[PDB]
Amino acid sequence: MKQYEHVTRDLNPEDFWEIIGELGDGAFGKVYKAQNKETSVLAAAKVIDTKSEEELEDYMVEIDILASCDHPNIVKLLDAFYYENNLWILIEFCAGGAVDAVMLELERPLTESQIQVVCKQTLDALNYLHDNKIIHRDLKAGNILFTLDGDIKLADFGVSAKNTRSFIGTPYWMAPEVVMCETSKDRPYDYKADVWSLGITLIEMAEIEPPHHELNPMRVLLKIAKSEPPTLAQPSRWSSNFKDFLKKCLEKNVDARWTTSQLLQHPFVTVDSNKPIRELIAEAKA
């Protein structure tokens, strides 16, 4: 009975959106390519089997995050429906596809000039999220999408979190940070997990695969905990700016690891043209 701001109930999503293809699979099942029947707008459509009202509430976090964000490098919510025990999420379509799929299709990594554009725009998106106390929690090249104009959008907020999400009592003993709602979850610490993932994603774009890709996943967790942070395999092929930006992300001491606000001041992401990505997608169309 709970009325959700952005979710229609009891209407058939396919009366409005026509499935015209498949975009891939994932933890939440198959993701379709859909087309609005009236406007012809394209969309990625998540279709999530949800049996109970409790499951619906859990999946709603992604919808409320997408609905609340308004940033050019973050995919927008187009529609959402709950119908025949499925939650449909209609999300802005990016026709350039995911960055990891591009590297696999071309069988080569991105160049540094291309990485620099992706890094700047992804950082812009991450900084907006952190400013709004959102943690993406699944950053990787597979969750960065190319537009046909040569920009990127950050996608798949399926495990993202609003990190800060009745009587008061006598207040005389409350700490100032309690009164001011500056809890540990309001501080930079937790959001910096995304900064680490950015650094791994940069190596992934530089080398097609992330560090430790050859290891069993359980062994990868041990390596992450125990090893020094990863570096580029062929460091002499890459600029000191790129390697330095990575060092500020791939820093195991969380307090020393840079915030997105600090990274935005770094010379690696002083760049004002997306032309390397326009070139990447222009040759791919040939």
Ligand SMILES: COc1ccccc1C1=C(Nc2nc3ccccc3s2)C(=O)NC1=O
């Ligand atoms: C990375 O993007 C998403 C991940 C999960 C759910 C939706 C998306 C997504 C698009 N692309 C693709 N989806 C999928 C889904 C599975 C596998 C590959 C792909 S590539 C898109 O254009 N707009 C979107 O929100």
